[PDB]
């Protein structure tokens, strides 16, 4: 009916907006995550535990 056509029309408009977007390569995106993890590895207590002197817990 009218609602079914309107629902399908809304899905079509949403789908086309998602299709025409710029997508970067996965390798470039993967390298970005690697760079941030390496850069901020020192400031990660979970990664490298700090001594008990500066540990409130």
């Amino acid at each position: 009916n009218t609602a079914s056509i309107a629902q399908a029309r809304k899905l079509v408009e949403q789908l086309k907006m998602e299709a025409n977007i710029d997508r970067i390569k996965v390798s470039k995106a993967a390298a970005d995550l690697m760079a941030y993890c390496e850069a901020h590895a020192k400031e990660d207590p979970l990664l490298t535990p700090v001594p008990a002197s500066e540990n409130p817990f």
Partner: peptide, 9 residues
């Protein structure tokens, strides 16, 4: 689900 400070863990 949660991430660490550096997003490694």
């Amino acid at each position: 689900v949660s991430f660490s400070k550096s997003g490694r863990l």
